[PDB]
């Protein structure tokens, strides 16, 4: 046993003293020191871990290939395993197609996702060379990618599948040559022939054995019933890792035949219980397709719970019976395993018995009728019988760990040539703490025929045996209700079509023509996409890449996992970790701190706490928050210490053994609780123009309601992270930190300490992304690591796991708005009055300028004479929010095309009608009286009908809703206007630094940091126009306080405008340089210039500095320009929602975006599609929950759903206003980070318009003003439409 | 700096200039990304030009500076320095001397 | 000489655009710079001393 | 320089240099090197990119 073999890139690894819990991902990263495979959640819900796999199958002769999450997989598991990561199958000299294409085709980003993403197409190639367009996407459902919008991801991979300027070349892309892949290890395949022996590994706290036969596996589980079973490790990993479970004992059976087979009985299909779901699923697959359909009803209903269950990564090492064992409460198979009946083999040391899964095999909260030293030995799913049908449906969303997510399988079987009900079987999931079967229910159907009065009678049993408390663990008690009346009505309908495929046609029923599309089942709509955007002129040097689509400058590197983010930098031999510490109480005092229990964990340093911080423990953007808490928490959250010790793993053990005693204080955590207590940082802020009183009178209608705008995680896929190091000499350190904002960063450490900035050096070369959660949230990890370093003289890493940045960083803000507007009968706007209110957790930071941000963009694209906005910042006990891409535009102008959408509906007139006819008009003030210069909006708006015929598609929405019951389309156009520059005037700044070396390569650096959004490739395009010589020779490293000093933060979408401008000038100066040595060698080489300037004695280096000017709006005048020019954009987008489930299809977006003349379309048109999916997040699938208590719930991937590759609008359309140069900014472009993502509203309007729709046919009669809040997660739109099921009239 | 005491003459030299305590003004090293190609430290010149070109690096500053001391005479150095910042004045300059 | 600190460099590779950071003891950066970028046949911006 | 600490996958090397004042290189051998602990490589003219 001891020691463990295993391959690496080709590369033999031994290691004799392997520790059960050491992971393939932290074995790859620290301890063979490939970074290329990335940390992002380590929860198999991301995938930025994904590496391949490649065995010699025992029972098979043959070598495999598959993927698997690093992070999940023990390294205990991989003996005689040949692991390939990113690294090995090509490198920046040599790049392979994967990595070369998804570079080319802009497919890379902030990069963090892309070596996962590499691996997961790599892996698809090499088990199928030539994959379909459909096999692609699928080989992501288990990569999420937070800044590309996944559009040129699938059309660069396109191109493998055997199915105007353009943005890339396919054809320059290199040709495949199979032949070439990495060989199959020689050693493994002759180790290949020796038998497998019994391993034993054992580390610091666990046993690993790997046993090779059954009987070792029953023996010891006879003689040891504690051993824990461990197969794929897809859950244990799990609960190890977040739930703090410790299994000293572990067992793995996968070598271990008997659990592996798959043997086709005359009843069924028999699985071993170890068999991944990859297996069952390739099984059942030729199954279905090769056996008359009449025998694959079950079958079939597994596959389709098994579709949408995590991805390739996850379904290769997840057995079948791992998820039967865990027994959780939303398991998707178990619900059809009861419901079909299926066969369950158990065996332990000599005995052996089979039992059918019922009501009685899961006696508790994840428990089974297994005896502690039984294992599951095999699953038999089976064949169904003529005369029996079978469905399986489960819930649009998640929002709890392991219950409240509806899943169900439903079985009935009739009396031969009859419609005679024989047996009836409806299990159900997410409806209690365990699978349950409605046994109540359908004995009572028996001998019944297949008509309206079961359908009654089973929506009325339901209804009653299946009831919800309003008190309920996991809420959402409503929906839940109503899917499983609305579940069993599909396979109600369902089953009358297959009676009717069955020639029961006169005894059953006919189904109405319209009903037809409540039954269909998922469908993959090909994709269609077209970037539009202007070629430049034909005039332009073919060197001048300004308006060329020119790629990422660190896309191949970041393809390659070369490319190097803040935890891939190698540690020092002393290099020490460090844990954070926080806060379990929304309010609360701090009574006492032990540390007793972390002072007996290996490795230990030191607990550190506000006793320890040098100078001052005050910090935050306003001042007003505490490095480390200091007798009181405020939040769930609240930093109060942190950890040092030697490892990451030791830090974490010793965190959990600080123990806290608090004492509650009265708690302020929503909006109501602000309000009700008085609770809001500073004054009132408001805009007002105009006589309102005077308008609401002369209005035909006044409408008053309400609105309620879920936040947001940033989610960017590399955390929070800092590395300090100290230099023991006068205070001086350097941290090297993925954030946004390096002025503060170098400050708040600086002040913290007790020394001058001048002694604090901060270093970004690039962040995983950012999106505003790092413009400052970033400091409350800097200060603390900053600490340690200084305590201990050494230098200090931490790197955030994913539940620890959502709790403690914050996110978009919660709005509240109470609107009332006046209109004529016409449509036209007269009066508006709206309050706001944000809920801004327990500091300042930086939600006053978001609301006022909000208040600035209450107009959105309209015209109002007579307004008034208030605004009101929330104090509260939950985590700090902060600036998130938008900055509180998005909501202000949510919440105006709501009010909007209602002013159309009550005057019953075309809503894009309503919108353009008060739409502003070029020349016009806004509503803080700001003067709309070069208004392209309605060119956007007349080229965005036009290009996407939206009055034809009106048309066929239309006739779609007629024509179909239980789907309805909904098809909306939005506008907008985003109003550019940081509220705060002085932020509009920026500057740069250029170094012409005497070999004429140039050095360049500017104030701001790349986190995806390509702002160095934007800049070296600036400066190659602005010098005269090629990009090639211009290069930018990184981003430094000590290059370029007190930078405004990377945010306001100004980036760009700001540093472009600071890099012209120092060009610019460069060139007035070098004028006298050109006008003498005209011809003369650049090189020449500057070799002649270098002798001649004349500097080659020069700083550049650009401020925005006439900038300063006055809200106590309200006048001044806050904004140097607005952004313009209009989106038109189409959806299919399921009346009867909630869920919804994207099927059509075309945008046309305003960035006047891009500096780069490719870029630009990324950020376009970025932005808009983080939109369609926001808008419809990104929902935060928290606990009464103030205590967020939704920690991670497999709670909090961003949009995956399949969230995209079907056909995706992008286009970039032509002739439209923004002479106010370099070289006449636009910012492009923020306006787009407010037009996935876009989205959200085509849902809620709908949703009318559905009401109009199944609800009161009337067209009222239903409510729809954001998100408009499946919950909400089903719920909001009401029919039979909702009112349980069908009862 | 080898030993020669160059960067405690650069500092002497830039608290002078800059009309500030020595104390205020920090030398961390040197770097080829900072100042690029630079003359090695030979030929006892050192000093004298660095000396000259961190004395210009220091009048940019001041001539920057200027409006804000004249507005606030006796107004200490730190507030110069912040009523700059947030007027959106460049607080960073090359300095050079041949 | 006899400096009693001998002549000495740590080269700190980046992975990156042939980028290279050099902590060294000498009396001449440029040069440094200069020569390690030619040996290795990269231009002088990547390389910082 | 060298009391900065050292990175965990840091490396040491050591100039091998000439013992005649002028002559024809014939031949280097380095079997015995490579058997020693640690020992990664050994670079010469042929090893300049
Ligand atoms: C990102 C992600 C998304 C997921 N999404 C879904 C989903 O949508 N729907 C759904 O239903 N599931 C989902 N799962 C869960 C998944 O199906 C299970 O985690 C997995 O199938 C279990 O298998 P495993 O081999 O990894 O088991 P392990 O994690 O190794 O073990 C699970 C448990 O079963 C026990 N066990 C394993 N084998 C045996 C045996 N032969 N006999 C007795 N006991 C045994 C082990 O002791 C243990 O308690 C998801 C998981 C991840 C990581
Ligand atoms: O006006 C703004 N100020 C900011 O600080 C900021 N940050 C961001 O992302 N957007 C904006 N907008
Ligand atoms: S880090 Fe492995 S799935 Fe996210
Ligand atoms: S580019 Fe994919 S997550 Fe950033
Ligand atoms: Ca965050
Ligand atoms: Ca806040």
């Given at each position: 046993a001891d020691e463990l073999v295993f391959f690496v890139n080709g590369k033999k690894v031994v290691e004799k003293?392997?520790?059960?819990?050491?992971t393939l991902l932290v074995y790859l990263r620290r301890?063979?020191?490939?970074?290329?495979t990335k940390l992002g959640?380590?929860?198999?819900?991301?995938?930025?871990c994904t590496v391949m796999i490649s065995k010699y199958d025992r029972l098979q002769n043959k070598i495999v290939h598959f993927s698997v999450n690093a992070c999940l997989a023990?390294?205990?598991?991989?003996?005689?395993v040949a692991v390939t990561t990113v690294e090995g199958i090509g490198n920046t000299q040599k790049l392979h197609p994967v990595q070369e294409r998804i570079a080319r085709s802009h497919?890379?980003?902030?990069?963090?996702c892309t070596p996962g993403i590499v691996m997961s197409m790599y892996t698809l190639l090499r088990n199928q060379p030539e994959p379909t367009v459909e096999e692609i996407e699928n080989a992501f459902q288990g990569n999420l990618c937070?800044?590309?919008?996944?559009r040129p991801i699938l059309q660069g991979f396109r191109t493998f599948a055997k199915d105007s300027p353009s943005?890339?070349?396919?054809?320059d892309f290199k040709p495949l040559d199979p032949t070439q892949e990495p060989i199959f290890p020689p050693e493994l395949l002759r180790l290949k022939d020796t038998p497998q022996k019994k391993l034993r590994f054992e580390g610091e706290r666990v046993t690993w054995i790997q046993a090779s036969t059954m009987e070792e596996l029953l023996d010891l589980k006879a003689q040891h019933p504690d051993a824990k079973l461990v197969v794929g490790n897809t859950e244990i990993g799990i609960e190890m890792k977040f739930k703090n479970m410790l299994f000293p004992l572990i067992v793995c059976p996968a070598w271990i035949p008997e659990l592996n087979s798959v043997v086709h009985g005359p009843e069924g299909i028999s699985f071993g219980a170890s068999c991944p779901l990859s297996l069952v699923e390739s099984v059942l697959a030729e199954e279905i397709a090769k056996l008359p359909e009449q025998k694959t009803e079950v079958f079939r209903g597994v596959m389709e719970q098994l579709?949408?269950?995590?991805?390739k990564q996850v379904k290769s090492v997840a057995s079948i019976g791992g998820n039967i064992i865990t027994?959780?409460?939303?398991?998707?198979?178990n619900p059809v395993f009861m419901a079909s009946g299926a066969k369950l083999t158990l065996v332990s040391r000599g005995t052996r018995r089979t039992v059918r899964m019922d009501?009685?095999?899961?006696?508790?909260?994840?428990?089974?009728?297994?005896?502690?030293?039984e294992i599951l030995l095999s699953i038999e799913i089976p064949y169904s019988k003529e005369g029996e049908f079978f469905s399986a449906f489960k819930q649009a969303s998640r929002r709890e760990d392991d219950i409240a997510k509806v899943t169900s399988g439903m079985r009935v079987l009739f009396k031969p040539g009859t419609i005679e009900v024989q047996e009836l079987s409806l299990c159900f999931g997410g409806m209690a703490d365990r699978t349950i079967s409605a046994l109540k229910t359908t004995?009572?159907?028996?001998?019944?025929?297949?008509n309206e009065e079961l359908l009654q009678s089973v929506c009325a049993g339901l209804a009653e045996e299946l009831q919800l408390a309003?008190?309920?663990?996991?809420?959402?008690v409503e929906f839940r209700r109503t899917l499983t009346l609305s579940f069993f009505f599909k396979f109600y309908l369902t089953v009358l079509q297959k009676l009717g495929r069955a020639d029961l046609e006169d005894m059953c029923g006919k189904l109405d023509?319209?009903?037809?599309?409540?039954?269909?089942l998922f469908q993959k709509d090909p994709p269609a996409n077209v970037q539009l955007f202007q070629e430049v002129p034909?005039?332009?040097?073919?060197?001048?890449?300004?308006?060329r689509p020119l790629p990422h400058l660190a896309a191949n590197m970041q393809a390659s996992g070369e490319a190097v983010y803040c935890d891939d930098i190698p540690r020092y031999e002393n290099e020490l970790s460090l844990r954070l510490v926080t806060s379990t109480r929304a309010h609360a005092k701090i009574t006492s701190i032990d540390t007793s229990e972390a002072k007996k964990v290996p490795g230990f340093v030191c607990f550190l706490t506000?006793?320890?911080?040098?100078?001052?423990?005050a910090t935050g953007l306003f001042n007003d928050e505490t490095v480390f808490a200091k007798?009181?928490?405020?939040?769930?959250?609240?930093?109060?210490g942190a950890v040092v010790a030697d490892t990451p793993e030791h830090a974490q053990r010793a965190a959990r053994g600080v123990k806290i005693t608090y004492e509650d204080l009265p708690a302020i955590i929503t909006i109501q609780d602000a309000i009700n207590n008085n609770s809001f940082y500073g004054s009132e802020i408001k805009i007002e123009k105009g006589d309102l009183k005077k308008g609401f009178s002369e209005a035909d209608n006044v409408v008053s309601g309400e609105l309620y705008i879920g936040g947001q995680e940033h989610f960017y896929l590399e955390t929070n992270c800092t590395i300090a190091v100290p230099?023991?000499?006068?205070?001086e350190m350097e941290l090297f930190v993925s954030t946004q904002n390096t002025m503060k960063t170098q400050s708040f450490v600086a002040k913290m300490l007790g020394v001058?900035?001048?002694?604090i050096v901060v270093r970004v070369?690039?962040?995983?992304?950012?999106?505003?959660?790092?413009?400052?949230?970033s400091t409350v990890v800097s200060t603390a690591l900053a600490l340690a370093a200084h305590k201990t003289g050494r230098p200090v890493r931490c790197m955030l796991d994913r539940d620890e940045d959502m709790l403690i960083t914050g996110g978009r803000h919660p709005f509240l708005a109470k609107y009332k507007v006046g209109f004529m009968?016409?449509?036209?706007?007269?009066a508006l009055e709206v309050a706001h209110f944000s809920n801004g957790g327990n500091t300042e930071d930086l939600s006053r300028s978001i609301m006022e941000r909000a208040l600035f963009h209450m107009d959105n694209a309209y015209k109002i004479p007579n307004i008034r906005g208030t605004g009101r910042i929330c104090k509260t006990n939950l985590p700090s929010n902060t600036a998130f891409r938008g900055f509180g535009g998005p909501q202000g102008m949510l919440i105006a095309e709501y009010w909007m959408s209602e002013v159309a509906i009550t005057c019953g007139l075309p809503a894009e009608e309503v919108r353009r006819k008060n739409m502003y008009k070029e020349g016009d003030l806004t509503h803080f009286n700001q003067k709309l210069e070069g208004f392209t909006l309605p060119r956007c708006w007349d080229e965005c009908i036009a290009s996407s015929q939206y009055l034809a598609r009106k048309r066929e929405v239309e006739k779609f809703n007629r024509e179909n019951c239980w789907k309805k389309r909904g098809l909306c156009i939005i506008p907008t206007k985003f109003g550019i520059?940081?509220?705060?005037?002085?932020?509009?700044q920026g500057g740069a630094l250029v170094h012409v070396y005497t070999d004429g390569s140039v050095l360049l650096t500017h104030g701001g940091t790349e986190m995806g959004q390509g702002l160095h490739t934007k800049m070296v395009q600036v400066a190659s126009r602005a010098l005269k010589?090629?990009?090639?020779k211009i290069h930018i490293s990184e981003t430094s306080t000590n290059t370029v000093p007190n930078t405004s933060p990377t945010?306001?979408?100004?980036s760009a405008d700001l540093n472009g401008q600071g890099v012209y000038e120092a060009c610019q100066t460069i060139l007035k340089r070098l004028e006298p040595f050109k006008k003498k060698?005209?011809?003369?080489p650049w090189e020449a210039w500057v070799m002649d300037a270098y002798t001649s004695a004349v500097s080659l280096s020069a700083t550049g500095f650009y401020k925005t000017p006439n900038l300063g709006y006055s809200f106590e005048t309200?006048?001044?320009?806050?904004?140097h020019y607005f952004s313009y954009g209009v989106a038109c987008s189409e959806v299919e929602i399921?009346?009867?489930?909630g869920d919804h299809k994207n099927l059509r977006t075309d945008i046309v975006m305003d960035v006047?003349?891009?500096?780069?379309p490719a870029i630009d048109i990324g950020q376009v599609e970025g932005a808009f999916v983080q939109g369609l997040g926001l808008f419809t699938m990104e929902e935060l929950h928290y606990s009464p208590?103030?205590?967020?719930?939704?920690?991670?991937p497999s709670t909090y759903k961003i949009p995956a590759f399949?969230?995209?609008?079907?056909e995706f359309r992008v286009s970039l206003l032509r002739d439209?140069?923004?002479?106010?900014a370099i070289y006449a472009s636009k910012a492009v980070?923020?306006?787009?993502?407010?037009?996935?509203s876009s989205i959200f309007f085509a849902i809620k318009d709908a949703i009318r729709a559905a009401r109009a046919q199944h609800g009161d009669n009337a067209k009222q003003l239903f409510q729809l809040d954001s998100p408009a997660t499946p919950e909400k739109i089903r719920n909001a439409c009401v029919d039979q099921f909702t009112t349980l009239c069908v009862t």
């Open positions: 003293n392997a520790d059960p819990e050491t301890k063979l020191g490939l970074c290329g959640c380590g929860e198999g819900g991301c995938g930025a023990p390294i205990c598991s991989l003996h005689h497919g890379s980003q902030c990069g963090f937070r800044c590309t919008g996944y943005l890339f070349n396919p054809e579709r949408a269950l995590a991805g027994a959780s409460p939303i398991s998707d198979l009501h009685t095999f899961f006696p508790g909260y994840r428990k089974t009728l297994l005896r502690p030293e004995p009572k159907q028996l001998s019944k025929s297949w309003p008190d309920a663990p996991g809420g959402m023509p319209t009903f037809a599309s409540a039954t269909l034909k005039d332009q040097s073919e060197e001048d890449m300004v308006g506000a006793e320890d911080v040098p100078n001052s423990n007798d009181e928490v405020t939040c769930v959250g609240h930093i109060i230099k023991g000499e006068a205070g001058p900035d001048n002694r070369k690039r962040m995983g992304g950012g999106f505003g959660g790092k413009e400052t949230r009968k016409t449509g036209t706007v007269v520059s940081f509220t705060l005037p002085f932020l509009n010589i090629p990009t090639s945010a306001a979408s100004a060698k005209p011809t003369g309200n006048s001044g320009n806050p904004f399921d009346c009867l489930t006047g003349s891009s500096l780069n208590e103030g205590s967020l719930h939704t920690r991670g399949g969230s995209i609008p079907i439209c140069p923004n002479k106010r980070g923020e306006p787009p993502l407010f037009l996935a």
